[PDB]
Design a binder for this molecule. Structure first.
Ligand code: 5HN
Length: 167
């Protein structure tokens, strides 16, 4: 049993809810929250900007030190950093950004990072301002992630469309 409440079960291991991931992280304090990161860990907008704002910019300060030491992530890659006041850990995952021309096939590689963690609170990778079709992102998630994933979809309209269209 875990602390996640009000989710809709899609599969054996994937659950979904209409929720602000920031508000959900603050309530649950999950072991892992996933950030919709870019390779530079520049948390300017969407999930990353909202998560970073909720940490009072401590996520960005930590991220800048990580990049100064290690250089940029790969598209499809990830790193584990602090979850600050939101979670134990933040798994920063880089899905491909369609608005930068990145290979959508990298979305499966991005989701494979989730399999290193038994339970996660996450957004749909490459959705929102990353430009991918969220229906596609949910299908790749279900077909890739084997660990237990609790998806927080920000848009009520989109949430209802994801549920209604789910095969
Ligand atoms: O994860 C989301 O629900 C999301 C919704 N809108 C914009 C965005 O970048 C992400």
């Amino acid at each position: 049993v875990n602390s996640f409440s009000g989710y809709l079960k899609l599969t054996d291991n994937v659950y979904i809810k209409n929720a602000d991931i920031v508000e959900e992280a603050k309530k649950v304090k999950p072991t892992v929250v996933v950030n919709a990161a870019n390779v530079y860990l520049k948390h300017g907008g969407g999930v990353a900007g909202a998560l970073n704002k909720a940490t009072n910019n401590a996520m960005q300060v930590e991220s800048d030190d990580y990049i100064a030491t290690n250089g940029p992530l790969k598209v499809g890659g990830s790193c584990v950093l602090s979850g600050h006041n939101l979670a134990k850990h933040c798994l920063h995952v880089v899905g491909p950004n369609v608005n930068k021309g990145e290979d959508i096939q990298l979305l499966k590689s991005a989701y494979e990072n989730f399999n290193q963690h038994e339970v996660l609170l996450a957004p749909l990778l490459s959705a929102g301002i990353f430009g991918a079709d969220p229906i596609h992102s949910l299908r790749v998630c279900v077909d890739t992630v084997r660990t237990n994933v609790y998806l927080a979809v920000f848009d009520k309209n989109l949430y209802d469309k994801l549920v209604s269209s789910f095969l």
